[PDB]
Structures are given as C-alpha cells and as structure tokens.
Design a protein around this ligand. Structure first.
Ligand code: ADP
Ligand code: ADP
Ligand code: VO4
Ligand code: VO4
Ligand code: MG
Ligand code: MG
Lengths: 576, 571
C-alpha cells in the first residue's frame, strides 16, 4: 500500500515537461536495447561470410553488414548522450516542485515535531530524499525495459540456433543472479538506511556546533567540540564500511559466478569449434553475447539494489514528515469578534510524561482588561500562554473563547484572534520590510513605516531606519532590545482580540518599555492583554494579577491586595 | 589545492589512490592490444585456417577475452577502491572544516548560517571526489590508449586514418579548453545560488514558529520559490552550454571518424585495404570513444571542480592580517581594566562607540546602563575580544588587549552573553564546555549555585538531553545553564550582559550573591535596565549614543541625571 503512494508522490513532482522528459528517457533506453540486441548477429553474419571463403563473398554485403554494426554502435552511444541530457533536464525540472513541497509540508507540521530536529538535519534530509528520487527515476526509466529486451532476445536467438548448453547456462545465470541478489538486497538497504541516518546525526551535530560557535570559542572548548564531531564521523565511517564490505562481497561473488558460468559457455564453444561441431560464426556470436550481456546484468543488479534501497530510505523520510494525525473538528468560516473573553477550565498539561507542568489551571479573563501573570522560572507561564496560542493540543481540561472551544477553532482563525509575543525573538535573515510583512502581507510602505514609530524603531543612533536594512542570521545585526522592537512592530500590523506579551519587553529601557506598552493599549483599546513579567511596575498597571507556582495558580486579585498576602509577590516587593 | 587534497589522505588513503591510478593505467595498456587481436582474427578468417591456424584463432579469441575480462575486473576494482578512498578522506576533511570554523573571527562567522556552512562542506566534499577521480582515472589511461592508437595506426602506414585520428584529438582538446572556463564560471555561479537557497531554507525552518503564527505561508513560500527559480535559471544556463559542447563534440566525431570509416570502406572495395585492416580501423574508432570521453571529462571536470573548490578555500582561510602579540597568562588572581578613548564602528557607515574613557578595578562591582542601542553589549564584546578593529586602547594590568592571546583573554574574562547558547547535548556536555576536566561532583556542586539542582520537585540529572536551542527548558533555566558555566571557570573579570533578565528577583539576587561569594576578587561589570543590580554596584556608568554621559554611585545619579531619576521613580 505504501509502495503505490511512493511512486504516486514521485509522479506528482513531474509537470507536463517532466512527464515527457521521463517518457523520452524510457523510450530512447528501450529503442537502443532493441537495436544493440541485433548487433551480435551482424557480427556472426560478418564472421561466417569471411570464414570458409578465400576472399569469395559479396564485398557489398560485408560493407552493408559493417555499416549496420556501426549504426548499432552509433545509435546506442547517441542514446546514452541523449538519455543523460534528458536526465539532467528532468532533475532540474523535478527539483523546484520537490523543495517547495518540503517547505509547505514543514509549515503544516506541529511545533512539537518541528522542535525535534535542527536546520542542519532538515536541510540534509531534503538532500537525501532528492537524491533518492533521482536514483528511483533513473532505475525505472533505464533498467526495467532495456535489460529485459536485451535478455529476452539473447535467450530467444541462442535458443533459435538450437544451442541448448549456451542458452541454458545463460538462463541459469540470470536465474541464480536474480535469486542470490534479491536474497541479499534488503540486507544492503537496511545497512545503507542506518548509515544515511547516522549521516543526518552528523550534519545535525555540525550545524549545532556552528550555531553555538561563539560559546565554544569563548570557553576555549575546541577539544570538547572537535571530539564529539570526530566521534560522530567515526560512527559514520563504521556504518559506511559495513555497507562497503557487503557491497564488495556481493560484487566479488557476482563476478566469480559470471566467470564460472560464462567461462564454461566460452570453453564449450571453443571445443565445439575445434571439433567442427560449432561454426566460427556461431562461436563469435556466443562470445559476442557473453560480452554484450554484462551491461543488462549490471542494470538488473543495480535495479534490484537501488530500487529497494532508495525505496527504504525514501519511505523513512515520508514517515517522519507526513505522520499528519491532526484533523481537529474545526468550525468552517467562523469569524471572530472585536471583544473576546477567555475561560480556562481545569487545564492540565505535560510536555513529555514523568512530569506535569500545569496542575489544574482554572482562570477567567475579559475584553479590554490587562492581566499580569507571574511566578518562579519553571512554574509554566510560557507553557500556559503557548497552549492558549495553540502550540500544543494534547491538554486535559477545556479552553473557551466566548463559548467557542479552542479545539473547534482553526489554527488560522486562532492566530488571527490571538497574537503571542514570544519570550525569544524570531527575526528572519532578510530586509526589515520582510520581517514586518510576516505580520501582514498586503501592508503598504506607509502602514509599515507608521508601525516603526509605534515600536520606536523609526530612528536608530540619530539616523532614520530604512525598510531595506539587511538583517543578519538571528538578527544579531541589531541590539537585544531592537530585536524585541521588530517583534513588537509586527503586533501593530496584526488585528487581534487577545494580546500576550511573554517577557517580550525585558531587553528594553524604562522609557521605551512604557511608551510601547502605552501605544499597545491606545492602538488596541478592546484587546484582552496577558502580561508575563517578574517586575512590579508591569504587575502594578494590570487590572488583576495571577501568581503561578509549580503548575497551579496560587494567588489572584489586585497587586496591592497581594504584595503582603502572597509569598512570591512579597519576595519581589523586597525593593527597599 | 592538490596539496590540500593530498594532506586529507593517510597511509591507507595514499595506497587506495595509487592502486586506483595503477589499475586504471594497467587496464588501458591491456585493452590497447585488443584491435590488433581482432585484425589477426579477421586475417585468419580470410587466410591460413589450417589445424594450427584454427588453434591460433582460439588462442587469439582467448587473448581478446582476457583483455575484456581484465578491463572489466579493473572497472569493478577501481569503484571498490574509490568508495574506500571516499570513506577514508571524508572524516579528515570534515574535522579540518570544524577546526577551521573555530579559528575564524566572530564577525566572519556571523556572515552566514548553519544551512550555508553545512551545504558548503557538501559542495567541497563532492568537488574533492570529482578531482580525486579525474586524476586517478582520466590522466594516464586515455593518454596510453590515445598514444598506442596513433603509434599502431602509424605503424601500418595508414596516414589518412592516423592523420584524421590525431586531427580529432587536436581539434577536441583545443575546442573544449576554449569553453572549459566559460562552463566553470556558469557552474560556480549556480553552486553559489544553491548555497543561497539552502541558507534561505535553514533560515525559514529555524523561524518556522514565527511564520506559522503569523499565517505567513504565502510570504515564506514565495521567497523560497523565488530562490528556487534563481537556482533553476542558473542551472539551465549551464545545462545548455554543457548540452551544446556535447552535441558539437558528437557531430565532430561523426564527421571526422565517419570519413575514416568511409575511406577504409572504399579501400576495401578497391582492394587497396585488407579486411583485416578495415576491422582493426573500425575496432580503433569504437575503442577511442571512452578515452575521448575521459579527456572530455578531465578537461571540463578538473577545471570546474578546481574553480568551486578555490572559492571554498578563499572564504574559509583568508586571514592576511594577524597581530604577532603572544604575551602569555596576561593576568593572575586580581585584575583592573583601563579603557582609553575607545571608538568603534561595525560597518564604518555609523559610529557605535564615540570616545569611551573608563577605569575599573579588582573586587569592585560596576553597573552599565543606557537606552537600547547605546552600545553596552558592543563595549563589553570589545572588552571580551569579539572585535579588534577599534580606535583607542584597552589595558589589563599594563598589557594591551591587542597583545593578549584570545585563549588567555577568555581565561581572564568570562562574558555572560545577552542571548543564551545551549548545545544540543547532555546538561553535562553544556557545562563541560566551561571546563573539560570537571569531575561529576564539581559539575553537580555548580548546579546548586546556579539554582538548577532541582526542577519541578525532581533532582536534575546531568544526562538531561537538551533539544535544539535548549527549548527543552524555560527562558530562566536557559540563563541558569550559562550561569552554572561561570562557576566551573576561574576569571578575574566577570561580565553579566542582561544575563539574569529571565530570572525572578529571588533567584537573580540568590545567584548574584553566590557569584560575589565564590569570586570575591573578581571585577564585575553588570549590564541591566533593572535597579536591583544598579543599587548594589560600587559605581554606575550611563551610556548614551556611544558616549559615557554619567558616573558615580546610583543614589548620587538619581538626583543629578534625569534618566537615573526617572528609572528609580518606577517604585
Ligand atoms: N553585529 C552587528 N553588526 C552591525 N550593527 C550592529 C551589530 N550589533 C549591534 N549593532 C548596532 O550597534 C548598536 C549598538 O549595539 P548594542 O551593544 O547591541 O546595543 P545596546 O546598547 O542595546 O546593547 C545597535 O543599536 C545596532 O544598531
Ligand atoms: N518545550 C518544552 N519541552 C519540554 N519541557 C519544557 C518545554 N518548555 C518548558 N519545559 C519545562 O516546563 C517547565 C516550565 O516551562 P516554561 O513555561 O518554559 O516556564 P516558565 O515558568 O519560566 O514560563 C520547566 O520546568 C521546563 O523543563
Ligand atoms: O523561564 V521564565 O520565568 O518565562 O523566564
Ligand atoms: O540590546 V541592550 O538589551 O543590552 O539595551
Ligand atoms: Mg516562560
Ligand atoms: Mg546590549
């Protein structure tokens, strides 16, 4: 069942030009194997015409025979060049469609599954899959019809000349070969998959070390860094050497079998020629078939290996990327209001197992009101707002948005209703314009520049900020606070009912922090605001404060009514 | 270039490479006898065919079979040795890259992402492979087969055949070398666009959550689709030139070798040329395709894999400037810092530090504050030796920073960065980054001082696996990993750049207390917008638009300076 889905996926990557290039590749490979299967007869016909005549034969017929053999050789080589030209054209063609399908498939994946592996890994995963497709496309377009044609004609013709020992041992070889190899193909595929997986692990570790180079440099940790890569490379080599040995043995054994079987057919026909039983023409024909048969035997060997091993390695890729189990019963086009109230009822959560992060969070929040959420680091403030922001779906309890449950809200609608300002910044390596267009695609040049003022990013170091400012990897082109302001400017282009600020202002100075937080409430008057902070001034300003401790909400109400009652907030309000 | 590829080969690597060259050379000698054996077989068919001439035909047929068998055994043996050599050279190449990346400057490292550096290694691996191959297979072997052909056809005194044969190799080597550079440039430019495309994929995948939550599939997809379109167009441009060269080389071969075939046909029809010679000539025409092809590869492949590999060495080894300083263990126990008229620019277009003049001393805690964009991080980064292109001077007990080895500087100073750098590995590995030789106890002791020995009423294991960017942990728990590192280190200067922002007042004060206790003589610079650290410091420094605008005690500054007055009023 998964075998059919695999080839349908490869077929789908081919547009109209792609389908033609693939069929042209199949046709040309098939046509040339018909033509080249004729050539050992031509050679035999040349041999007899000369043998046993003392220059007494049609010289015009020898020339016609020599020219037909040349046509065979020329057409077969033209076919090889034409196939490889079509092959590269089809690679180029299928490449783009393959790569976008991956990116679009990655976008539709859940946060939990995305977080599992780094960019180094996902980047080399595409690499392996692209190459795997390539191999499969080739093996199908070249090693299916062509070797069958050349092997059928060879047994048919050798059977026709009533040579039973030759056609017998010939058919015996293809039988012993196809059996022996298939009885060792899976064993190679498994050794190859396991190797390619270790290879992903190795690229994963390289990107992990390169992304945190600064840390390893500053701690003078070259030894620790180098050793864990050297270990990964050693796991890679050993996994590769294990494949190499099996591959080398199969090849040696297949070679020795060919030498024993085809060698006998050669000695048999030698003795047949020496005892006048077999003609020289026929001897040359059997000699010519033995030589010609190597390439279709090679193409079969390849197919049996390459098809099974690229199918296995490609199966594994489709698995860890399309395990789509979501299908949450969402309301079709249920547009959300200006004023939305949140209701969290007995919410429970665990990231893995073994540990519960949220005990039984019961909360009730309303439109146009600002709420503060605090507690020690490890309580689960981020976790709670992430669940509200639909990062995670396997939660116990219920979350409502004016009677409508989160479970019945589409991830697109939820993301339009709520805007989460993350603890960590996510700045795209692109223009400032691009980073802000992330919030709203259709935003005009003015709407974007207006938003810079609101985030206090219209002027940097008494100089006007350009929308074409190129932003380096992780936006380290900008200061900690300037990074936070990019993410803040995004909120102003969006139009949400709920606004979550998870320690999203921590890197800003008192002036900026207050001015932006002011502009937020001004621009979004009816917006419900959840604010996560460890600071009294951000807690003071709220309509109500919530204290989270080890998963459970331990205290509620006004900050002033809590700064003496609650153990945590009294600990914060220890500021002289 | 070839010295670099040679260096990647150990003893097993050098053997495998020479075995590959030998076997390729030996088989081309053997297969160059082949058309003469075919001639003798054609001679016998139209000649001697007595009992002895039948036995001579069989011994001849066996020699041709030996040629064909030995040539194929050689092909299989070469590919076995090639893969063995690939495996062999692979590890040595990859570590050289990592070690080369570690020794690069922060400014150059920041220039490209992981997606880019990862696929950069990929391209160079493949470029080495091609070069190793074209050298071990397409140099001696085609020369042997082309020399012997012209020698033998010259010997049978056929001038038109050996003439047009030599003419082809001459026209071929000329025509192709004329277009090789044009192909290499089109290929390099394509491979570079390919890096740009992998760079954009890793950039999008690393910031997927942002694009997902902003429902930005269209903007994200469009950007990649554009990059892929720049990739296809760069690839199609190479494809066409490649396809033209191949079709023109094919048409030239059909015209020149076709003539040699027609000439010898007419020679056979007019009794001028024997059938035995006619076969030997077509047998040489057929045989010559593979050495012509291997020269076609050698000419084109050696040049294009040298161009793209030249680029890779350029961007990963150019460091013409190197200050021959070297004063060793520049400091012991105690340290003082002296910044004199420090000025700095990142891209020279704008000045970040105007003329910072500061003086700091042992055992004293100092606070540095100012608006976001003033340059607090910039200044401490320069103190931490991130950048060396600065005007002015920085001293560390009379010794200038310029004369302090990056190793010694990193042992004297410990910078706790604004952003956290958690390795995807065990907690043990993340802390062993600070001190390799640290014992299980030294590491666990440090976990307590970091307030990380217990998470959610459970004791923290040193074998805790930490996901990509340490997102397996809370913002504050990430900061505590970086803080736990400091307690394994032994510095004279300790910089805390907003390194406790994600921590609550209880832990911030509790850890900051254990820092001062464990490092009593340590000079401490603290960058904070909060006051619970500014009030605690022996002196406060206010940075505004590059220049240090205010100094002294915090209390004496919330009277004098309006910024410090306004900040304290947040009570
Ligand atoms: N690596 C960099 N490349 C270019 N410009 C940078 C870089 N890092 C920071 N900047 C610029 O230098 C200014 C000062 O740097 P920084 O220390 O990060 O500011 P802050 O006072 O917020 O700590 C920033 O406002 C920013 O525009
Ligand atoms: N993505 C995650 N995967 C696994 N564990 C996590 C994740 N995020 C946080 N945790 C765990 O959950 C707890 C609290 O998480 P978090 O919401 O980030 O904390 P905080 O109270 O600082 O907001 C921690 O004890 C931490 O180990
Ligand atoms: O790990 V937290 O308390 O959001 O900073
Ligand atoms: O970018 V700074 O947060 O150190 O103001
Ligand atoms: Mg949090
Ligand atoms: Mg800073």
């Amino acid at each position: 069942k998964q075998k059919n889905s695999l080839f349908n996926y490869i077929y789908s990557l081919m547009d109209v030009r792609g389908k033609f290039l693939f069929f042209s590749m199949l046709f040309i490979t098939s046509l040339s194997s018909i033509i080249i299967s004729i050539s050992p007869l031509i050679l035999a016909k040349i041999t007899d015409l000369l043998s046993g005549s003392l220059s007494n034969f049609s010289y015009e017929y020898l020339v016609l025979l020599a020219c037909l053999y040349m046509f065979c050789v020329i057409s077969n080589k033209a076919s090889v060049f034409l196939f490889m030209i079509l092959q590269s054209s089809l690679r180029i063609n299928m490449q783009k469609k393959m790569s976008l399908k991956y990116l679009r498939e990655l976008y539709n994946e859940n946060i939990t599954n995305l977080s599992k592996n780094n960019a180094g890994y996902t980047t080399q995963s595409l690499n392996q899959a692209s190459n795997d497709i390539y191999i499969l496309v080739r093996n199908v377009s070249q090693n299916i019809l062509s070797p069958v044609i050349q092997l059928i004609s060879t047994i048919v013709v050798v059977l026709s000349t009533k040579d039973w020992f030759s056609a017998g041992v010939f058919f015996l070889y293809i039988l012993v070969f196809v059996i022996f190899n298939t009885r060792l193909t899976g064993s190679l595929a498994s050794l190859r998959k396991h190797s390619m997986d270790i290879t992903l692990n190795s690229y994963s570790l390289l990107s992990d070390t390169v992304d945190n180079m600064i840390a390893a440099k500053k701690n003078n940790a070259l030894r620790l860094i180098s050793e864990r890569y050297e270990d990964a490379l050693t796991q890679e080599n050993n996994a590769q050497k294990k494949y190499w040995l099996l591959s080398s043995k199969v090849l040696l054994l297949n070679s020795l079998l060919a030498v024993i079987l085809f060698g006998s057919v050669f000695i048999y026909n030698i003795l047949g020629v020496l005892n006048g039983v077999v003609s020289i023409g026929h001897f040359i024909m059997i000699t010519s078939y033995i030589i010609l048969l190597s390439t279709p035997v090679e193409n079969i060997g390849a197919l049996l290996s390459e098809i099974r091993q690229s199918m296995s390695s490609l199966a594994g890729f489709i698995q860890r990327h399309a395990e789509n189990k979501a299908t949450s019963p969402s309301i079709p086009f249920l547009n959300m209001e200006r004023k939305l109230n949140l209701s969290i009822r007995e919410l429970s959560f665990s990231y893995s197992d073994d540990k519960k992060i949220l005990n039984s969070v019961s909360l009730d929040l309303f439109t146009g009101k600002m709420y503060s959420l605090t507690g020690p680091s490890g309580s689960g403030k981020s976790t709670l707002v992430k669940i509200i922001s639909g990062y995670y779906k396997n939660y116990f309890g219920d979350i409502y948005l004016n009677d409508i449950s989160l479970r019945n809200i589409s991830d697109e609608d939820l993301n339009d209703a709520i805007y989460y300002l993350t603890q960590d910044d996510y700045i795209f390596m692109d223009t400032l314009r691009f980073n802000l267009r992330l919030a709203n695609y259709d935003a005009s040049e003015n709407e974007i520049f207006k938003v810079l003022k609101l985030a206090n990013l219209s002027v940097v170091n008494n100089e006007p900020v350009s929308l074409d400012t190129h932003l380096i990897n992780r936006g380290n082109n900008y200061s900690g606070g300037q990074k936070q302001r990019i993410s803040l400017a995004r909120l102003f282009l969006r139009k949400p009912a709920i606004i979550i600020i998870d320690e999203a202002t921590s890197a800003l100075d008192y002036i900026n922090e207050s001015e932006i937080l002011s502009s937020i409430r001004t621009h979004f008057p009816d917006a419900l605001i959840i604010n996560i902070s460890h600071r009294i001034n951000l807690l003071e300003c709220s309509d109500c404060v919530y204290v989270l401790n080890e998963g459970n909400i331990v205290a509620s109400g006004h900050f002033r009514d809590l700064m003496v009652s609650n153990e945590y907030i009294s600990g914060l309000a220890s500021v002289t």
